[PDB]
Design an enzyme around this catalytic site. Sequence first.
Site, PDB file in Angstrom:
ATOM      1  N   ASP A 200       3.537   6.930  -0.194  1.00 31.42           N
ATOM      2  CA  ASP A 200       2.351   7.733   0.088  1.00 31.42           C
ATOM      3  C   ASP A 200       1.688   7.208   1.355  1.00 31.42           C
ATOM      4  OD1 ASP A 200       0.310   9.793  -0.945  1.00 31.42           O
ATOM      5  OD2 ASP A 200      -0.908   7.994  -0.649  1.00 31.42           O
ATOM      6  N   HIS A 356      -1.965  -2.091   2.132  1.00 31.57           N
ATOM      7  CA  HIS A 356      -1.070  -1.175   2.811  1.00 31.57           C
ATOM      8  C   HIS A 356      -1.340  -1.264   4.302  1.00 31.57           C
ATOM      9  CE1 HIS A 356       1.235   2.512   3.603  1.00 31.57           C
ATOM     10  NE2 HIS A 356       1.697   2.386   2.373  1.00 31.57           N
ATOM     11  N   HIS A 390       4.427  -0.765   0.241  1.00 33.02           N
ATOM     12  CA  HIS A 390       5.597  -0.956  -0.620  1.00 33.02           C
ATOM     13  C   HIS A 390       6.842  -1.391   0.149  1.00 33.02           C
ATOM     14  CE1 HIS A 390       3.007   1.575  -3.156  1.00 33.02           C
ATOM     15  NE2 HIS A 390       3.709   1.149  -4.188  1.00 33.02           N
ATOM     16  N   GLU A 415      12.064   4.027  -2.974  1.00 31.78           N
ATOM     17  CA  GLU A 415      11.235   4.995  -3.697  1.00 31.78           C
ATOM     18  C   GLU A 415      11.881   6.369  -3.625  1.00 31.78           C
ATOM     19  OE1 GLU A 415       7.172   4.918  -2.651  1.00 31.78           O
ATOM     20  OE2 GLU A 415       6.569   6.556  -3.982  1.00 31.78           O
ATOM     21  N   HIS A 417      10.603   9.495  -5.251  1.00 26.06           N
ATOM     22  CA  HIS A 417       9.609  10.226  -6.028  1.00 26.06           C
ATOM     23  C   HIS A 417       9.656  11.736  -5.790  1.00 26.06           C
ATOM     24  CE1 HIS A 417       5.144  10.028  -7.556  1.00 26.06           C
ATOM     25  NE2 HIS A 417       5.984  10.475  -8.471  1.00 26.06           N
ATOM     26  N   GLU A 460       8.460   3.732  -8.587  1.00 35.23           N
ATOM     27  CA  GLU A 460       8.565   5.170  -8.835  1.00 35.23           C
ATOM     28  C   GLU A 460       9.955   5.721  -8.545  1.00 35.23           C
ATOM     29  OE1 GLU A 460       6.473   7.424 -10.158  1.00 35.23           O
ATOM     30  OE2 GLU A 460       5.095   5.800 -10.679  1.00 35.23           O
ATOM     31  N   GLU A 536      -1.250  -1.229 -11.412  1.00 31.63           N
ATOM     32  CA  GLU A 536      -2.283  -0.426 -10.769  1.00 31.63           C
ATOM     33  C   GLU A 536      -3.376  -0.092 -11.774  1.00 31.63           C
ATOM     34  OE1 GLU A 536      -0.606   3.156  -9.177  1.00 31.63           O
ATOM     35  OE2 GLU A 536       0.267   2.205  -7.407  1.00 31.63           O
ATOM     36  N   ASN A 596       0.380  19.919   3.452  1.00 29.92           N
ATOM     37  CA  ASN A 596      -0.507  18.766   3.494  1.00 29.92           C
ATOM     38  C   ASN A 596      -1.219  18.608   2.164  1.00 29.92           C
ATOM     39  OD1 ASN A 596      -1.990  21.071   3.772  1.00 29.92           O
ATOM     40  ND2 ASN A 596      -3.085  20.431   5.618  1.00 29.92           N
ATOM     41  N   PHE A 600      -5.965  12.819  -0.288  1.00 26.43           N
ATOM     42  CA  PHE A 600      -5.409  11.656  -0.951  1.00 26.43           C
ATOM     43  C   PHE A 600      -4.933  10.604   0.026  1.00 26.43           C
ATOM     44  CE2 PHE A 600      -5.213  14.953  -4.135  1.00 26.43           C
ATOM     45  CZ  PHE A 600      -5.611  14.287  -5.270  1.00 26.43           C
ATOM     46  N   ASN A 603      -8.393   6.508  -0.333  1.00 24.64           N
ATOM     47  CA  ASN A 603      -8.181   5.443  -1.322  1.00 24.64           C
ATOM     48  C   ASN A 603      -8.863   4.132  -0.928  1.00 24.64           C
ATOM     49  OD1 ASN A 603      -6.575   7.030  -3.072  1.00 24.64           O
ATOM     50  ND2 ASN A 603      -4.876   6.788  -1.634  1.00 24.64           N
TER      51      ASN A 603
HETATM   52 MG   LIG Z   1       4.956   7.886  -5.559  1.00 22.33          MG
END
Ligand SMILES: [Mg+2]
Lengths: 614, 205, 205
Positions: A200, A356, A390, A415, A417, A460, A536, A596, A600, A603
């Site tokens: 993400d 991140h 990540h 990942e 996802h 994930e 998390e 888009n 989000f 964060n």
């Molecule tokens: Mg994910």
Amino acid sequence: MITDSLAVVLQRRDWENPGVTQLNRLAAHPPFASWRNSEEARTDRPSQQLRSLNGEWRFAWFPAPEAVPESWLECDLPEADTVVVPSNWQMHGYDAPIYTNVTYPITVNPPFVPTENPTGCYSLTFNVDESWLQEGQTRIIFDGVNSAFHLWCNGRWVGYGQDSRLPSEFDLSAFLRAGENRLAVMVLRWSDGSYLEDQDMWRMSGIFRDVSLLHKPTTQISDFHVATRFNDDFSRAVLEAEVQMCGELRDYLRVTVSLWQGETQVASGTAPFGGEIIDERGGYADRVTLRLNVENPKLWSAEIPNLYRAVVELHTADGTLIEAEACDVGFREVRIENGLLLLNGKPLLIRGVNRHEHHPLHGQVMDEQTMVQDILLMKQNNFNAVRCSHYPNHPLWYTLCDRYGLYVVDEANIETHGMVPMNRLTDDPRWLPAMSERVTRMVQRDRNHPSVIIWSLGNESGHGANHDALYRWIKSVDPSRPVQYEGGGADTTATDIICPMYARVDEDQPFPAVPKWSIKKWLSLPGETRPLILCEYAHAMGNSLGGFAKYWQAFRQYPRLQGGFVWDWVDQSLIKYDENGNPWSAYGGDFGDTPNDRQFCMNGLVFADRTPHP
Amino acid sequence: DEANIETHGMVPMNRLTDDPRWLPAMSERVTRMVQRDRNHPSVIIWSLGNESGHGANHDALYRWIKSVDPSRPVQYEGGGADTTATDIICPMYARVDEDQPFPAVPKWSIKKWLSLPGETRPLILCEYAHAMGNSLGGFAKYWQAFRQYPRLQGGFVWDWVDQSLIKYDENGNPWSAYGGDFGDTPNDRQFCMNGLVFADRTPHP
Amino acid sequence: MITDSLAVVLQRRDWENPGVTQLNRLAAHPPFASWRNSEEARTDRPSQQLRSLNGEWRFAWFPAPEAVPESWLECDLPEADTVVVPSNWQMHGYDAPIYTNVTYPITVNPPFVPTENPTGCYSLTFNVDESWLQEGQTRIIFDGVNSAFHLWCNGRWVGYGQDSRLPSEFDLSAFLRAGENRLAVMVLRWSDGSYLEDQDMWRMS
Ligand SMILES: [Mg+2]
Ligand SMILES: [Mg+2]
């Protein structure tokens, strides 16, 4: 010529096939940079052999890799600008970066990519030293590229690489010559490796870390491991080191391992090559293992560092030395006994944060001045454990997480996802070679440091057979740290400590086939003994962290709960200028992309300046 | 059944196995076996390799068989036949009463294996009673211990058929050729028979 | 043409690199051969779709893969015999097979091989059915090769394989056409896969 014309490098396409992940690459090793005199190993002065190639470069942009002209590798095109490298070509104003949460940008169809890849051309002219071409080899080091890239040296072909975050190193011994030299690098946007990274985050592509050049003598050292062990009363300590050499072998070569603290010394040892017979023909003829012993150490903890210093050198028998390297070392011991995560014979209580890697002005580029504000602003507010999410970071973050006092959780680069269901590319065993080149080459880079205490496979990506396959490979080559994995319900055989995400405290919610039970209810199920550390909790966009006080009663009443990690530390915003010149923080899909997700990306626990939230 | 791995020449015999640069080329010979031979009712024990030392990769593929097919056991020999990469003990050429110690890879006696501290698994021999020329002497002593003790299970006999090649003289009459007589260097000149029958077939005594 | 001339297939050498083990191969599956009516599944009568290509082939022998002429893939050379396939070229009387117990034949130096590989050329001319090119795909199946091999269909390039004992299968959908067709296969002696098989047996290829 042939086959170094551009008509024959391109087809057959190597960036569409998951069986070809590299051509002409070397092994991995912890970073050492090889200075010459024995004195500077203690003082860590800037070496003279390691040479940096940052600065200005030539650049040009093409819409597809099939339209690039052939006269580029001879001389530079007249249409190039001057671009400072490291930087991304998204922020200079050529394309528009894209942002998604769960869906892939391109159409889902493995293992293909579409036929319009934005490709780029970098070029550099440099002078080389005279004595470097006489003896020894000259290794060339790239610390970052996104995503796949080809390389040309002086009009001839060298190699090809795939992976994004971890470094890549090439050999350049017999190609260059005296005086001036060219380097032409072509960078590609999308490739097969894009089907295994779906974090993400923003989506940019380019050369974004350091680029350097290094010199070694003909006989060199390659690798070395450092391990410690203890008695029960924490009073007598044993150090053992293993030194891996290479190249030409003789008889009269000797090694020396000296242990230093402050200005005086403690212990020393020498031994010649060869020993330790193993099954069943003979023993290793290139390695040595040395043992030293110390009395009453000063231990490493989260509150006080107490680092030592170690010098490993290779010298002849009379004699003048040839190489010396250094790595910092500290003493600790981490283990699980009877159901608690124990460190130094005490139970532990983790309170941490996810981090991140991001910056508002320069994109993905990290300087030095930011990483000191992050650790100073974490320590004053009572955190002591950070999770890199990540992907593995710049190779300087760890040594700043040595001298100050906080724990580190590390992670490979996996990942998936987006696929339907989320274990298609993992359970199918055609993808085992391309997936087992992202975990092996992590452990050989980050195993000497004293900060990392918990390895983690991925996030994930469903459950399958491969996540059981790599797990014994970490637990058979390094037994001194536990292994953690989340997805699939966080109960399976591929983990040792339970780690659900976003689990509640009193109420529970059932799903089909992947429940999330209550946090007091997990431990009392029939046949369950392991501890529980949350991966998390307490999502924090806008006004949030409500109900936070109820976690920190249950964390102190129950014995076997241990704490958790908070998402997320820093915002991910990007800047953009209006007609007045005044800036305003941009978010989500406002650059001009489709689709888009538009909220989000914040964060936030602080802003992007940095300046603290309430 | 068995995959295709043997590294009986390198020094020591776990160089190409413990080094993890060779994991992709080595994990394309076990995965593509299991997807070919899993419907048949005859195969009951999988096996990884033979005479290739011990390392991390042989622990890595073991959960990959034991996680995608749980209905059969997994067997592996080399390194002393006691390690974590197996489920049933399988030494080669272990004796019955006397024992011989080596450095770092012993071969204990077959009645002594089971009584060591903390050992519970059964024992099926992978190779016993080498059979070149006049051999199979002392064979009757195995088949008393195989019926008295409960937990021993039996073994496998090397080897069934000879490996000979034919060649013609000037008369036209043939004669069985062996070893390095074609004109090669080097050679080993007797260890190609290993016979329980001839190459016709016609039985030995 | 380019890149299906022999000057550009050879370098850079794929038979020396342990990261390239295959090009253009399909998945594995238990063998089924796909007959059409529902009645013959119970009786196991010989199917009509599965077609066998045994018989006679054209053959020639070269001392090194760098001396093979370029006009081979156009038409067949006048110096070829007629050889029944499957067979080894060791038993016909071209080379001499070798035998060892513990040592490698070539000098131990991973991951290289020496520069004199005995290489071979097979060729075949065949007719194809008319309705097979209209619909569906036509899969081509090799059940054995030793050790590494290149393949050409009608003067164009297809793929490359490494492993010896397990089969290999290629896709050949859009290449062939009506009437007659060529297949030219070039077989190599030593490669990187030789450093993982060292059984106590004869050495043929
Ligand atoms: Mg994910
Ligand atoms: Mg052997």
